[PDB]
Amino acid sequence: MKRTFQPSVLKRNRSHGFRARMATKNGRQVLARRRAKGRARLTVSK
Amino acid sequence: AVVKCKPTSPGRRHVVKVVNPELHKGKPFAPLLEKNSKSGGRNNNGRITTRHIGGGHKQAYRIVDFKRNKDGIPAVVERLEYDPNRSANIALVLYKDGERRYILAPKGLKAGDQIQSGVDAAIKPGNTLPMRNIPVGSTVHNVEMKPGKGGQLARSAGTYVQIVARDGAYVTLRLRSGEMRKVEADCRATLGEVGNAEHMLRVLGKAGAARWRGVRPTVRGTAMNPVDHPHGGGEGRNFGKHPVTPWGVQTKGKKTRSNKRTDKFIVRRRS
Amino acid sequence: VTSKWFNIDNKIVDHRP
RNA sequence: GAGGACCGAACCGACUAAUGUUGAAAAAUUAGCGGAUGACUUGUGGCUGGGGGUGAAAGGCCAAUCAAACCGGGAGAUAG
RNA sequence: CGCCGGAAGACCAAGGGUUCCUGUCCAACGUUAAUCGGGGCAGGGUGAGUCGACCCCUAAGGCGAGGCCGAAAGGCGUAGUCGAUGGGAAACAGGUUAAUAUUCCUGUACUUGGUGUUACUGCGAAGGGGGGACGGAGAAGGCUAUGUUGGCCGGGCGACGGUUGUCCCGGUUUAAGCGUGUAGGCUGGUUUUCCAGGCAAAUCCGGAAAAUCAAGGCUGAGGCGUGAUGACGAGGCACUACGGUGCUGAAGCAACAAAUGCCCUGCUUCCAGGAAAAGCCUCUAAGCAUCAGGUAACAUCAAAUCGUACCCCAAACCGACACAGGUGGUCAGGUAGAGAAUACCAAGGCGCUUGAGAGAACUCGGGUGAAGGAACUAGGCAAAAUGGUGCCGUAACUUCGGGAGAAGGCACGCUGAUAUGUAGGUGAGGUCCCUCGCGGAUGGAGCUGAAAUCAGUCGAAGAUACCAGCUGGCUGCAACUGUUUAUUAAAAACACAGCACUGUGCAAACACGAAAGUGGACGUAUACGGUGUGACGCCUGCCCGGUGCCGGAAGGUUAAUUG
RNA sequence: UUCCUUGUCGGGUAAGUUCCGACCUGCACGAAUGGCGUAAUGAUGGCCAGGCUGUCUCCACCCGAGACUCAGUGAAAUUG
RNA sequence: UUUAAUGUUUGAUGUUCUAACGUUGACCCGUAAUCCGGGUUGCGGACAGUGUCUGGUGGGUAGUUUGACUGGGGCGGUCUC
Ligand SMILES: N[C@@H](Cc1c[nH]c2ccccc12)C(=O)O
Ligand SMILES: [Mg+2]
Ligand SMILES: [Mg+2]
Ligand SMILES: [Mg+2]
Ligand SMILES: [Mg+2]
Ligand SMILES: [Mg+2]
Ligand SMILES: [Mg+2]
Ligand SMILES: [Mg+2]
Ligand SMILES: [Mg+2]
Ligand SMILES: [Mg+2]
Ligand SMILES: [Mg+2]
Ligand SMILES: [Mg+2]
Ligand SMILES: [Mg+2]
Ligand SMILES: [Mg+2]
Ligand SMILES: [Mg+2]
Ligand SMILES: [Mg+2]
Ligand SMILES: [Mg+2]
Ligand SMILES: [Mg+2]
Ligand SMILES: [Mg+2]
Ligand SMILES: [Mg+2]
Ligand SMILES: [Mg+2]
Ligand SMILES: [Mg+2]
Ligand SMILES: [Mg+2]
Ligand SMILES: [Mg+2]
Ligand SMILES: [Mg+2]
Ligand SMILES: [Mg+2]
Ligand SMILES: [Mg+2]
Ligand SMILES: [Mg+2]
Ligand SMILES: [Mg+2]
Ligand SMILES: [Mg+2]
Ligand SMILES: [Mg+2]
Ligand SMILES: [Mg+2]
Ligand SMILES: [Mg+2]
Ligand SMILES: [Mg+2]
Ligand SMILES: [Mg+2]
Ligand SMILES: [Mg+2]
Ligand SMILES: [Mg+2]
Ligand SMILES: [Mg+2]
Ligand SMILES: [Mg+2]
Ligand SMILES: [Mg+2]
Ligand SMILES: [Mg+2]
Ligand SMILES: [Mg+2]
Ligand SMILES: [Mg+2]
Ligand SMILES: [Mg+2]
Ligand SMILES: [Mg+2]
Ligand SMILES: [Mg+2]
């Protein structure tokens, strides 16, 4: 039937994109943690 | 004219509709319209703060003149119109200078009638005067409470206020609720009652007719679970408690007015 | 994965209450 | 030419039976079944956040999780 | 040979991202083999002033200089600035690659800017006005896409009786643009004077008065002319790597039927009363005044950047799979039919990536069944049966609408005549008239065409297949349409119109918020919140001791404070 | 809603713990946590009749897909 | 024991007032602005409102408790001398 993941790249970027993380203090702490861990991809971007 | 519909359908059996043949069949005056978007009862936090509000027909706001401060210039009633935002009808008036405005249509008003505002107007329905110039015992509507602020009392269909007494700087009014109130004698009021007094005789007839007005369904508290309402719970239909609101304050009797800065203006509460 | 459907069903499981 | 009107495909549902139950499928298939101009249905975008939301009210739904989501921490909780 | 054909065909948006095309390979992948592949390796392929994005403009909503508020982090919000799923300029037909095309080529167009020359001239906005600019249903009328038949052209004369004719097959296509202004729809027109309005001004918009003219204006599908002496074209001929390539080319008309598409954002009607802003048109203010600017003609230059392959009801997206699931929009042929249902077909695409045998029990999906006919069973579960159209006929009860398709019954094919094809629809030529045309009148050729009656006729059966109500009697509950436990419960439960009690006088009660603020509501007691009951009909009795709420204030008791 | 209880009487059946009508001895109905009616409606509960039938008496035969044999590929729960 | 007079306020109640305070009245300005601030004015006015302290109410919310023996548990009974 209809499943939970219904892709849309506009809603993907508006929700979890780089500029959405940078818009709040807690989003900038996520990016701080993912740099400290060494993640190759910080966010869901291009 | 209230007309009972014939029962060709079970949704039509109990419909009573009010038909006024004198309403304008056409579009409203476009310069005096505005956008008016619906809320859903939600505030700027995004939360439902009033229940049972939602959907309905799209509406446009008509800028109605509640102040009536174009003093001295006589105006003629052009037509009567439907207003979706209030229960009464609105009249389009044209001033002698060539300005058009909306007012609340009083009872007995027709297209072609002459209305005037200001202290020197005659005592005829539709005319606005400060209440120091209106004889005691007159029936008025669209009454101001602060001078220059616009009418705020007796604005729904069929309603009116009675000027009971005048004592120096205040007039005593009998409000439509039965309350006696004092307001300044310099506030304005319009002579006569608000038209469309047959509004209250209408019957909606079906559940979907109330959804067209933006009214969503009400769940009785006794039909919920205890986590939801103070009345929830039971095996079968059980109440055994004093009725209360969903937030635990007693309903059916407990008085909730607490305003000490306006107690001075209230001669007698409603009975 | 989840439990087998007969091990979740009350009718099959709850035979001796 | 009215109507939460009537019969009935698309469309939305899910009343009965049989199959399947290490399935074709972590809820379907076949044969019938209900509504079908409306309190209808759908695309796109938006808003409400966890003792909180939303609820035509079933303790239902809130990413196959719900009488209190998920992730990380207190944390090697405590366990006659 | 079989299957789909309102899809299992064609084109897209979203999503994916090289799966696209060519050569080459078969180790792994492909539920088997594989010389094949959406697999491996290598190479190639995506061409735009007009399509889409970007761009200008805004909705819901977001962020928010100052600001108000908050232990801090932060919350709200004004000016603003973003945000489409909506508004805003312009291109069509034909040809071509293995793979791209409204992008390349041929032919024919259009749009908006800048620069300069010439002619005339009041230009100017962050402001005023108009417009943009808007609902549901219904009813037709005028059309076209499209289809059928005839005419015309090219071919044919038949594997088995017949087939030179009232016979067979195939074709009969052409755009945007430009010119005209029609079926319709809306509206009285023109001039002058005056004015408490449109924040100021206005010659613009609104208002007032007089005069005069009976028409003017706006909008508008289609058709027609051109585009087009062109292109395309059944075929034919010449070659070929047998894939294709090259050359040549007939007819290209009329009648009828007809949309769910267009006129039509129209018209009629109802109540539930139906976006915003810019582009656009106009008026002026400050200002500039032989300037700048505006208008018109001509020349000239510019139109950048990004997407463009392929799949898209799917083996390429969401489901761990090459998974009987899910997925928004556009197109919409024939015969029967009311039809987008259903059966058979066209264009087109497929035969579902294990097969070969045999012909046991048993399981699954179906077909038929002697006599009986619910005796089965928890229970007619499941099956079987009914089933269309037209006409006749139809009870209790009723809120007078219903019940009602009650129940029940009759007719139904083909052929001929009425009538060499009727009633009806369309309507040429011709003649007449005038306004000389996209006109009116008359006229009836031609095309199309039910329904009926009579007579005959075949079969067991004429609604022949597919498709397509079982019906009646008594009673509980809930008035009714709806909603509900996604994934064992669809109900008598929830909702509901109606009823009643109750709070609320507006900075409302109430709710979300350490607060500011927001909703209620740009509402005002014929209103709003809460609670119970639940259409309608007849009704709703007694108890105020207990608990709760409302009112009272004498007296008793009673906090911080004082001392 | 009634335990005793399959109350008793009548109707329907050859035979009726269900159903319908009545009685009232209401364990333990009752008036907006509404009483009593009610036309129309319901994939709603119970009962009766007609038609129809493989539901049954009591099964028989036939058509397909598996099961069986052959070639290829090739699992699973479980297990001192 | 009971008074009355003068002077004095100690409170309390009422009546006026305006200058704190309020204004989700009007107008003007910042300003191209339904925020905010400033100014003029009207209306309320020492009331309302807010802080600290204090009595009442408070399943709206929170943390917890709700014994053992027992011919199974519960119900009953018992629990020390
Ligand atoms: N038995 C069914 C339905 C089912 C799914 N999950 C279940 C769990 C419990 C009981 C039944 C189910 C099945 O396996 O498909
Ligand atoms: Mg409500
Ligand atoms: Mg209600
Ligand atoms: Mg419940
Ligand atoms: Mg509670
Ligand atoms: Mg009970
Ligand atoms: Mg209907
Ligand atoms: Mg559902
Ligand atoms: Mg089905
Ligand atoms: Mg239907
Ligand atoms: Mg429960
Ligand atoms: Mg879930
Ligand atoms: Mg610890
Ligand atoms: Mg541990
Ligand atoms: Mg076929
Ligand atoms: Mg690849
Ligand atoms: Mg390929
Ligand atoms: Mg292989
Ligand atoms: Mg490949
Ligand atoms: Mg913008
Ligand atoms: Mg291609
Ligand atoms: Mg022969
Ligand atoms: Mg396959
Ligand atoms: Mg699939
Ligand atoms: Mg679909
Ligand atoms: Mg079909
Ligand atoms: Mg067999
Ligand atoms: Mg038989
Ligand atoms: Mg027989
Ligand atoms: Mg029996
Ligand atoms: Mg059945
Ligand atoms: Mg009963
Ligand atoms: Mg229903
Ligand atoms: Mg369920
Ligand atoms: Mg179900
Ligand atoms: Mg109820
Ligand atoms: Mg009291
Ligand atoms: Mg009985
Ligand atoms: Mg009761
Ligand atoms: Mg009771
Ligand atoms: Mg009572
Ligand atoms: Mg009661
Ligand atoms: Mg084998
Ligand atoms: Mg508790
Ligand atoms: Mg603890
Ligand atoms: Mg114990």
Author numbering:
A (entry chain B2): 1 to 46
B (entry chain BC): 2 to 272
C (entry chain B5): 8 to 24
What does the primary publication say about this deposited structure?
Free L-tryptophan (L-Trp) stalls ribosomes engaged in the synthesis of TnaC, a leader peptide controlling the expression of the Escherichia coli tryptophanase operon. Transcription initiation of tna is controlled by catabolite repression, while the expression of tnaA and tnaB is regulated via a transcription attenuation mechanism resulting from the tryptophan-dependent stalling of a ribosome producing TnaC, a 24-amino acid leader peptide. In the presence of inducing L-Trp levels, translation termination is inhibited when Pro24 of TnaC is in the ribosomal P-site and the stop codon is in the A-site, causing the ribosome to stall. Our structural data reveal how the ribosome and nascent TnaC co-operate to capture a single molecule of L-Trp and explain the role of various functionally important residues, such as the strictly conserved Trp12 and Asp16 of TnaC, the 23S rRNA base pair A752:U2609 and residue Lys90 of uL22.
To address this discrepancy, we also determined the structure of a wild-type TnaC–70 S complex stalled in the presence of L-Trp at an overall resolution of 2.9 Å (~10% of particles). Although we observed an overall weaker density for TnaC compared to that of the mutant peptide in the TnaC(R23F)–70S structure, the excellent overlap between our wild-type and R23F peptide densities indicates that the mutation does not alter the conformation of the nascent peptide, with the obvious exception of the side chain of residue 23, which makes different contacts with the ribosome in the wild-type (Arg) and mutant (Phe) structures. Unexpectedly, the wild-type and R23F TnaC–ribosome complexes exhibit nearly identical conformations of the nascent peptide and the ligand-binding site, indicating that an R23F mutation within a region of TnaC that is positioned near the PTC does not induce an allosteric conformational change resulting in a binding site with increased affinity for L-Trp. For wild-type TnaC, the concentration of L-Trp necessary to obtain 50% of the maximum accumulation of arrested ribosomes on codon 24 of tnaC ([L-Trp]0.5) was 0.32 mM, while maximum accumulation was observed at concentrations greater than 5 mM. In the TnaC–70S structure, Arg23 of TnaC would also clash with methylated Gln25235, albeit less severely than Phe23 of TnaC(R23F), possibly accounting for the higher puromycin sensitivity of the wild-type complex compared to the R23F complex. Although we could not detect a class containing RF2 for the wild-type TnaC–70S complex, pull-down experiments with biotinylated tnaC mRNA demonstrated the existence of a stable TnaC–70S–RF2 complex.
